[PDB]
Design a protein around this ligand. Structure first.
Ligand code: CHL
Ligand code: CLA
Ligand code: CLA
Ligand code: CLA
Ligand code: CLA
Ligand code: CLA
Ligand code: CLA
Ligand code: CLA
Ligand SMILES: CC1=C(/C=C/C(C)=C/C=C/C(C)=C/C=C/C=C(C)/C=C/C=C(C)/C=C/C2=C(C)CCCC2(C)C)C(C)(C)CCC1
Ligand SMILES: CC1=C(/C=C/C(C)=C/C=C/C(C)=C/C=C/C=C(C)/C=C/C=C(C)/C=C/C2=C(C)CCCC2(C)C)C(C)(C)CCC1
Ligand SMILES: CCCCCCCCCCCCO[C@H]1O[C@H](CO)[C@@H](O[C@H]2O[C@H](CO)[C@@H](O)[C@H](O)[C@H]2O)[C@H](O)[C@H]1O
Lengths: 80, 37, 194, 95, 733, 75, 186
């Protein structure tokens, strides 16, 4: 399973959640930004490591980071 | 005393090139495939 | 301040004014660190004192007709015996190194443990010239100025001999014979394109 | 050259200066190794091999123990044979 | 889950074939194993080193055994000039009769390989004369191999495992290794030369059976204990001495003749005896420098702490470096590879020009192979030196504990370092390539007098300082009135000057404009390879494109296509790219060494002087001209003894070209292709009864770069090895 | 050697003068793809004295940027 | 305050004086693990015990006129062929030594075959233990003296002593180390 971390520079644009092709991320309420919402990564066991979320994050440096880790059938994206 | 027999290559070349590799590959293939208890 | 090495210049701040022989000369600011300057202050006096002995000794040998400073140790090479003022000495090179190494180690080691003393006085000033400690300013200035002059002179001895091969007294005689035709501009060594 | 005079003579000089000249200086520099601290703090056999288990006490007033005698004597022997060996090269045929 | 690998649960849980590949590839990265502690890390490494030592002594034993069993050492020693050494016998059932006859040579019973490693000249020089001498050495080293293997087992046992602090006693290890490992070993080797090697070179047998009753010198130890050490340098071997015989021999055991033995064209044994005695004294003395349990010596931490320039030019200086070096194995390994890698180059440089083994010079194939062998090994070691320096920064570097010291300040001006290496590489490449192309155009248009030939005056001036009188500089040793010439005129200059002014040996070969261009190409190789490796290390911890690269490790595929694309952004990839430039650099060095020597060995040095100034000459007169015999090893009319090198020559081209596939085409193409193969197997009747246990997948991104680089390197090495040996051996051997 | 350096410094100095000149404009990027020929010719002729102008910038300390005004990566 | 090898040197802590012959001599601190010191103490005696017999054998053989010199005994041929001697020795010594080790592990003392300690005559006490070590150490030093004196002088132990007694100042290590050609040229 890969590791996905959300850092406190998130502005709650939701672009990472829309970009993710496996519904790994979601938005949750927060008080640390104007949007009052923060990205969350509750389902990292389904993450494949494409890093489409990082491509979509506007903040600099990124507020969502993916650290490729142990491989499995789900993280290796196998249908066999 | 040291000199090996004149027929040593006939036995050792096939042994180390065809026989031991076969047993080594079989040993390694079984080992990697073996499942933990 | 004993003067200004470059008239119109500003003396470096890190050079204290009362330091003997302070002309404000430090283009490369080597004495900027106080700890380094303290070591340099001692080394200049020691270098100057040895240079004064060396220049006096080098000139004395040739003035009295015993050769030049450069030829003095040749006896230990060719196979001759040492001589001092024409008086034969019974020692050989390997023996001489023994006395010097032990003797100089004792003296220099004793000086080294003093932790930077450069004006001991006491037994080293039997006649009491600097016993006053108030009028010593001029004597310290005279010592360093003659010391710096001697250091420059000895470099002249080495540099001149490497170019012409003659002793310091012989070189002086040759300059006076033909001042315009016998100088560093006529070596054929110092200025390659002349 | 006579080996007995040269080797003994050089050793005496190096023992004499070591005992009377550089003993104070040498000891002060040895304390600069104290500022860093001990090598290890352990109680295993391999940790014990890095400690001064035996302290070489001496009755000499200045503390010139045997380890110092070995150090300064070795330099004298090394210098003594350098002098003898170099002097031997004089009057050598085809060498 | 699967058992293998036992050291990583992440790999063992992987259901794909990546588990097999990655398990092999992470076996020796002990720091990454599950449950690893610092103390267990050092004990495993200590055990692994015993295994490496046992392999080295077993490999050496195998060489000694096979030469004695199947070689012609006893025949070769009689006439080393006109006999090709034998490496080992051939038993290949695939051979045809013409092949069996072709490889029968040297008076051997059957087919054999000719040795190129120079062990014959080495062993003959050190006093070996019979096959039984080699047999006893082989059994002795096999026993030594066993002992080290046992020691590796012993020190893993409960009561013999050293503690962590034992491995970090720097002062004690340096004292022993300098005085004992270096000093005593060199003193012992002097004993062999004085007692065995030198007498054997003078026709007197000395073995274990009689060496206690044979006097190495007529005056036995009286000169040694009386200080009259000059007695050992009297009556050296005369210029008429015939090596291995008592005619023309002398009596001295320690000399400084300084030249080459006239017959063997190699260094005198009495000089190599005095050499090893001299450094042994220096190394034994140097090993009494550091602190131990006896209250004298330096502590390395104190030395580093002291050396801070008072002006603050180096910041904190060397403060904190003792822990930085003493706690990081990658820092220590980087210093070991950098030092050993440079010394490997030095061995190659000095062995070809100061041949130490009798009759080594005349064996052209051996000299070519030995120089190429060690230069390629040095090149790999240097790349590893920088790789582990990059690994140190990611894994072991601690910014807080290195605050303001020299190491930290290197990262402060890393852009300046990289920018200037970039400028030097560009400058050398532009003007080096430009001058070659200019000279090529002039040759093409038929005006060889219009080309730009720059005389290597600076290097020719160095050769004058050493006594080469060809250039007429009359400088230092080239002038008979200088003090340098006079002082050494009674010790070693007569022999040294005689050798350096002999133009038939490789001691300071004459150089010209052809050597000017090649040397500047070598500089381009060194600077560019350093640029790639140095960037990989200084940028390892992060960069503007990836500020937090340290959090991902030394080796990772990429950071994805975002931010413009980040392919080959890790420090592992900088090393991967630098290996190509290392091969390119060592290739230029070995082409230059080989071509300049082939022309010398044929007597026609003018060919190199004329054809080496433009790049068509290299392609025409070196690569194309010298391939004629190689590619005729087998042809439609038959084959000869070179057919193995002809076959290996194409074998290299194939492995090299196969590597392009792993480097050009990347993973995504192959993973999708494998998915139809998985579909095909499952739907095929009579085959879907059989099935796999590891799900097939394409190689990883990082794996294919290594696999592609391995094929590239292997094909590189095997192609040139076959050409180097075949061109040299066929021409003369 | 000194023939080439004069021309090489000429080309480099002229380009640096032009690059500084357009940094003050509203849209520097559009002044780089589309060259301001009247300005370039003006700077082309004044470059003949680059060694004099280059040295005077060095002594006045305006040749180099300040270390604090240059971006660098984390270290 | 027992006597120590160096005047005015307090013995190191790991040496308590319990062992026989404990003079506090361990400049390298080799014995500091209680598990190794016990092994070394047993190892000291066995090396000394073999040295004591060896020194007596060399002296006894020389005093009884046995030839050739003790360093040429192997070359001489005896009733049993040299090839047969080694297998006999290997089996016999292997048995004695293996049982020697087995008893030491169980009891921690020294003995013979199945008896640990092996003191049939009942002579055993702290004084006897001390006397064994001091005589053992002397034999160990003595044997090395024989080996080196054979190398340099090439004379048997008693033969060397007589030469020194006859000509003390003329004959000594100073003479032999500077006359190897003369002595070895005979
Ligand atoms: C206790 C151990 C022991 C010791 C210290 C010696 C010591 C010696 N033996 Mg002895 N042996 C020992 C046990 C035995 N030896 C032999 C059988 C021999 C033989 C057959 C010979 C020696 C010889 C030697 C000498 C070897 C000199 C040399 O450098 O040869 C180096 C030689 C080679 C490596 C070959 C030396 C005096 C030799 C001798 O006396 O020479 C004059 C000799 O010929 N020994 C046997 C079998 C019964 C032993 C059994 O324990
Ligand atoms: C205690 C034993 C002992 C005794 C009584 C003697 C007695 C004698 N030896 Mg022998 N010898 C010994 C030990 C002994 N040796 C050892 C250990 C060695 C090896 C270094 C030698 C090597 C040797 C040689 C090479 C020669 C003699 C010779 C002689 C004779 C003249 C004296 C001489 O030159 O001595 C001076 C030289 C010595 C080496 C004697 C040293 C004796 C002291 C007591 C040894 C102390 C060792 C010490 C405790 C070890 C500490 C180790 C440390 C790491 C803690 C004389 C009969 C000469 C002769 O004429 O032989 C026929 C001669 O040529 N001996
Ligand atoms: C690492 C060292 C090494 C290497 C690379 C080789 C390489 C070779 N050996 Mg040699 N060999 C070695 C050490 C080595 N040997 C040693 C130490 C011995 C003594 C036991 C032998 C005994 C030996 C024999 C008897 C034969 C070879 C043969 C061969 C060839 C075919 C391989 C084979 O049959 O091996 C066999 C290897 C062994 C029996 C010993 C292996 C020992 C290690 C520890 C396992 C090949 C050229 C054959 C040959 O010459 O064919 C033409 C052959 O018949 N070798
Ligand atoms: C060191 C390795 C090695 C060895 C010893 C051999 C040996 C042989 N190869 Mg080669 N081969 C090898 C590696 C090796 N090969 C590799 C790596 C490849 C792939 C690149 C090949 C590809 C290859 C091909 C394509 C062919 C050979 C063939 C041969 C035979 C040529 C000589 C002949 O006329 O045989 C004649 C053979 C016989 C008279 C019979 C020999 C004994 C047979 C093969 C086995 C008997 C087994 C026994 C009845 C029961 C089990 C006994 C066992 C448990 C002890 C011979 C058996 C040729 C051949 O004839 O193969 C059959 C052949 O066509 N090889
Ligand atoms: C004594 C020196 C030394 C030591 C102790 C180590 C030790 C280590 N290195 Mg280092 N290294 C060295 C030399 C050394 N290195 C050199 C010389 C280089 C330059 C080439 C490198 C370059 C290097 C890199 C780039 C990396 C390491 C890494 C490592 C670690 C893991 C190694 C591993 O798992 O290998 C496993 C071994 C393999 C997968 C196979 C190795 C064999 C290769 C692929 C070539 C095979 C060729 C083949 C035999 C040819 C066949 C020919 C055919 C015709 C038959 C380990 C701590 C890795 C690490 O984790 O660092 C933190 C890492 O990334 N090293
Ligand atoms: C023959 C092949 C080749 C060539 C010529 C180069 C050239 C270069 N490499 Mg590259 N490289 C190669 C293969 C090659 N590489 C391979 C196989 C790899 C493995 C992936 C790499 C990996 C690599 C790395 C990792 C690095 C380089 C670097 C460099 C530069 C080194 C400095 C230099 O020589 O500057 C002088 C420049 C040259 C010799 C380039 C050719 C110039 C031509 C002749 C100009 C022609 C102009 C003319 C007007 C015609 C134009 C026509 C056109 C408009 C139609 C240079 C640009 C380093 C770099 O970029 O340093 C700054 C660097 O970091 N290379
Ligand atoms: C087989 C040899 C041997 C061994 C194993 C020992 C072992 C021991 N001795 Mg003994 N000793 C020996 C020979 C030996 N000794 C000899 C020949 C002498 C006379 C010079 C002495 C004189 C002596 C004294 C005066 C004392 C000891 C003591 C000790 C104990 C503590 C030191 C230690 O751990 O040493 C371990 C030793 C070794 C592992 C041997 C290392 C040998 C090296 C590798 C080579 C030495 C070469 C030599 C200098 C020439 C220990 C039981 C001390 C104690 O308390 O005893 C009860 C003590 O006070 N020994
Ligand atoms: C370490 C102890 C030791 C060892 C290994 C040897 C070994 C040897 N001795 Mg020596 N010997 C020793 C102790 C030792 N001795 C002692 C303590 C004495 C008493 C003083 C002798 C007295 C002695 C004599 C008188 C002779 C030997 C001889 C021999 C040789 C032949 C032995 C034989 O045939 O025995 C076979 C006999 C038995 C196994 C019965 C033993 C009964 C108790 C052999 C080299 C003989 C020889 O040829 O010397 C050159 C010889 O003449 N030895
Ligand atoms: C008691 C006393 C005293 C006396 C003392 C003495 C007398 C001492 C001595 C001492 C001594 C007398 C010492 C010695 C030492 C020595 C040594 C320590 C040595 C060493 C050596 C070496 C190390 C060597 C080496 C080498 C070799 C081997 C070879 C060649 C090279 C060389 C040389 C390097 C007095 C009166 C003063 C005071 C009071 C008390
Ligand atoms: C990155 C990194 C790293 C790495 C590094 C490296 C890899 C390096 C290398 C380096 C090198 C590889 C260097 C080299 C150098 C050299 C030198 C510096 C030399 C010198 C020489 C000399 C000085 C000489 C002289 C002389 C002559 C010339 C002649 C005569 C004689 C004489 C001696 C006088 C480490 C690990 C640290 C870690 C951190 C990071
Ligand atoms: C031909 C002419 C050749 C001349 C060669 C001269 C060689 C000099 C070798 C000096 C060796 C070191 O010896 C010298 O070390 C220290 C000075 O550096 C002195 O010792 C002192 O030095 C420190 C630094 O100044 C002081 O802070 C301390 O009080 C003390 O450590 C020693 O008392 C002296 O003996």
């Amino acid at each position: 399973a890969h590791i996905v971390k959300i850092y406190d520079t998130c502005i709650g644009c939701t672009q990472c959640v829309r970009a993710c092709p496996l519904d790994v991320l979601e938005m949750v309420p927060w008080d640390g930004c104007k949007a009052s919402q923060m990205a969350s990564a509750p389902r990292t066991e389904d993450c494949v490591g494409c890093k489409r979320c990082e491509t979509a994050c506007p903040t600099d440096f990124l507020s969502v980071r993916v650290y490729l880790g142990s491989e499995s059938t789900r993280s290796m994206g196998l249908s066999y | 005393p040291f000199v090996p027999p004149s027929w040593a290559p006939s036995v050792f070349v096939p042994l180390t090139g065809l026989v031991l590799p076969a047993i080594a590959m079989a040993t390694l293939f079984v080992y990697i495939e073996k499942e933990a208890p | 301040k004993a003067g200004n090495w470059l008239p119109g210049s500003d003396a470096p701040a890190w050079l204290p004014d009362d330091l003997p022989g302070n002309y404000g000369f430090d283009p490369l600011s080597l004495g900027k660190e106080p700890a380094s300057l303290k070591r340099f202050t001692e080394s200049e006096v020691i270098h100057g004192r040895w240079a004064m002995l060396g220049v006096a000794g080098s000139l004395a040998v040739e003035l009295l007709g015993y050769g030049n400073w450069y030829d003095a140790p040749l006896w230990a090479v060719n196979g001759g015996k040492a001589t001092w003022f024409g008086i034969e000495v019974p020692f050989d090179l390997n023996a001489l190194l023994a006395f010097e190494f032990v003797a100089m180690a004792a003296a220099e080691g004793q000086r080294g443990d003093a932790g930077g003393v450069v004006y001991p006085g006491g037994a080293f000033d039997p006649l009491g010239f600097a016993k006053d400690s108030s009028k010593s300013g001029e004597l310290k200035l005279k010592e360093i100025k003659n010391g710096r002059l001697a250091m420059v002179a000895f470099l002249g001895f080495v540099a001149q001999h490497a170019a012409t091969g003659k002793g310091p007294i012989a070189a002086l005689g040759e300059h006076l014979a033909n001042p315009w035709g016998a100088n560093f501009a006529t070596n054929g060594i110092s200025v390659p394109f002349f | 050259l006579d080996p007995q005079i040269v080797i003994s003579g050089s050793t005496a000089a190096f023992l004499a200066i070591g005992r009377f000249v550089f003993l104070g200086y040498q000891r002060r520099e040895a304390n600069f190794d104290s500022t860093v601290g001990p090598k290890t703090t352990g109680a295993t056999y391999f940790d014990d091999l890095q400690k001064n288990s035996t302290i070489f006490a001496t009755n000499d007033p200045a503390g010139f123990n045997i380890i110092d005698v070995a150090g300064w004597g070795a330099l004298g022997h090394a210098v003594g044979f350098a002098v003898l060996a170099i002097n031997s090269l004089q009057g050598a045929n085809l060498s | 889950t699967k058992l293998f690998p036992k050291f990583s649960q992440g790999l063992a849980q992987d259901p794909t074939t990546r588990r097999i590949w990655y398990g092999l590839a992470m076996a020796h990265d002990f720091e990454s194993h599950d449950g690893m502690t610092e103390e267990n890390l050092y004990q495993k490494i200590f055990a692994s080193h015993f295994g490496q030592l046992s392999i080295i002594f077993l490999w050496t034993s195998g060489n000694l055994f096979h030469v004695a069993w199947q070689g012609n050492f006893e025949q070769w020693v009689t006439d080393p000039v006109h006999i090709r050494p034998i490496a080992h016998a051939i038993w290949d059932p695939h051979f045809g009769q013409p092949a069996v006859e072709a490889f029968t040579r040297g008076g051997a019973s059957g087919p054999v390989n000719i040795s190129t490693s120079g062990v014959y000249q080495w062993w003959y020089t050190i006093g070996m004369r019979t096959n039984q001498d080699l047999y006893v050495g082989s059994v002795f080293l096999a026993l030594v191999s066993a002992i080290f293997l046992f020691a590796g087992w012993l020190h893993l046992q409960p009561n013999f495992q050293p503690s962590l602090s034992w491995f970090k006693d720097a002062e004690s290890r340096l004292n022993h290794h300098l005085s004992g490992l270096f000093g005593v070993s060199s003193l012992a080797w002097t004993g062999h030369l004085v007692h065995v090697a030198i007498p054997e070179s003078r026709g007197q047998h000395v073995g274990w059976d009689n060496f206690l009753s044979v006097l190495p010198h007529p005056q036995g130890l009286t000169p040694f204990f009386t200080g009259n050490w000059a007695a050992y340098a009297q009556s050296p071997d005369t210029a008429s001495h015939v090596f291995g015989t008592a005619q023309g021999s002398g009596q001295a055991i320690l000399t400084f003749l300084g030249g080459f033995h006239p017959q063997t064209q190699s260094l005198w044994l009495t000089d190599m005896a005095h050499h090893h005695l001299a450094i042994a004294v220096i190394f034994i003395v140097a090993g009494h420098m550091y602190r131990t349990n006896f209250g004298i010596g330096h502590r390395m931490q104190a030395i580093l702490e002291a050396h801070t320039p008072p002006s603050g030019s180096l910041g904190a200086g060397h403060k904190g470096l003792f822990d930085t070096v003493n706690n990081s194995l990658h820092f220590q390994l980087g210093l070991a590879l950098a030092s050993v890698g440079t010394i490997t180059s030095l061995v190659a440089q000095h062995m070809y020009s100061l041949p130490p083994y009798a009759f080594q010079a005349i064996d052209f194939t051996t000299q070519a192979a030995l120089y190429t062998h060690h230069q390629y090994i040095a090149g790999f070691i240097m790349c590893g030196a920088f790789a582990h320096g990059a690994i140190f920064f990611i894994r072991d570097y601690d910014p807080e504990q290195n605050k303001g010291n020299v190491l930290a300040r290197m990262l402060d001006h890393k852009e300046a370092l990289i920018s200037h290496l970039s400028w030097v590489s560009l400058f050398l490449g532009f003007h080096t390539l430009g001058l070659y192309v200019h000279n090529d155009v002039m040759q093409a248009f038929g005006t060889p007098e219009k080309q730009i030939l720059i005389e290597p005056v600076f290097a020719q001036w160095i050769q004058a300082a050493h006594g080469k009188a060809l250039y007429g500089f009359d400088f230092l040793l080239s002038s008979k009135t200088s003090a340098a010439f006079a002082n050494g005129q009674s010790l070693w200059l007569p022999g040294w000057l005689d050798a350096i002014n002999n133009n038939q040996n490789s001691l300071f070969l004459t150089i010209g404009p052809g050597d000017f261009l090649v040397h500047h190409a070598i500089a381009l190789g060194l600077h560019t390879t350093t640029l790639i490796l140095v960037k990989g290390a200084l940028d390892a911890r992060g960069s503007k494109l990836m500020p937090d690269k340290k959090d991902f490790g030394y080796s990772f595929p990429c950071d994805g296509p975002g931010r413009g694309g980040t392919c080959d952004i890790s420090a592992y990839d900088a090393f991967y790219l630098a290996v190509f430039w290392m091969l390119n650099t060592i290739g230029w060095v070995t082409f230059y060494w080989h071509w300049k020597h082939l022309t010398l060995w044929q007597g026609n040095v003018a060919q190199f002087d004329e054809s080496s100034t433009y790049l068509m000459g290299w392609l025409r007169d070196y690569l194309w001209l010298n391939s004629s015999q190689l590619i005729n090893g087998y042809n439609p009319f038959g084959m000869n003894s070179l057919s193995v090198w002809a076959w290996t020559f194409l074998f290299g081209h194939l492995i090299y070209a196969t590597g392009f596939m792993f480097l050009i085409s990347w993973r995504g193409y192959w993973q999708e292709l494998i998915e139809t193969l998985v579909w095909a197997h499952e739907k095929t009747p009579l085959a879907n009864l059989v099935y796999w246990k590891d799900k097939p997948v394409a190689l990883s991104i990082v794996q294919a770069r290594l696999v592609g680089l391995a094929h590239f390197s292997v094909g590189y090495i095997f192609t040139y090895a076959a050409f180097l040996i075949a061109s040299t051996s066929g021409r003369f051997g | 050697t000194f023939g080439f350096l004069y021309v090489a410094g000429y080309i480099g100095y002229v380009g640096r003068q032009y690059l500084i000149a357009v940094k003050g404009e509203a849209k520097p990027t559009d002044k780089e793809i589309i060259i301001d020929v009247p300005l370039a010719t003006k700077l082309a002729w004044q470059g003949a004295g680059w060694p004099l102008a280059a040295v005077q910038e060095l002594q006045r300390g305006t040749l180099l940027e300040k270390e604090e005004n240059i971006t660098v990566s984390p270290r | 305050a027992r006597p120590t090898w160096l005047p005015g040197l307090n013995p190191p802590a790991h040496l308590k004086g319990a062992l026989a012959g404990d003079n506090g001599f361990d400049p390298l601190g080799l014995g500091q693990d209680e598990g190794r010191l016990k092994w070394y103490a047993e190892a000291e005696k066995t090396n000394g015990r073999w040295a004591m017999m060896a020194v007596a054998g060399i002296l006894g053989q020389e005093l009884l006129g046995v030839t050739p010199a003790w360093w040429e005994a192997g070359a001489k041929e005896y009733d049993i062929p040299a090839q047969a001697l080694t297998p006999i020795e290997f089996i016999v010594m292997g048995f004695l030594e293996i049982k020697r080790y087995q008893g030491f592990k169980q009891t921690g003392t020294s003995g013979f075959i199945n008896s640990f300690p092996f003191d049939p005559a009942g002579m055993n006490s702290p004084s006897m233990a001390t006397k064994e070590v001091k005589n053992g150490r002397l034999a160990m030093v003595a044997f090395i003296g024989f080996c080196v004196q054979a190398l340099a002088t090439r004379t048997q132990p008693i033969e060397g002593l007589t030469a020194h007694l006859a000509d003390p100042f003329g004959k000594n290590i100073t003479y032999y180390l500077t006359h190897l050609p003369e002595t070895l040229g005979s």
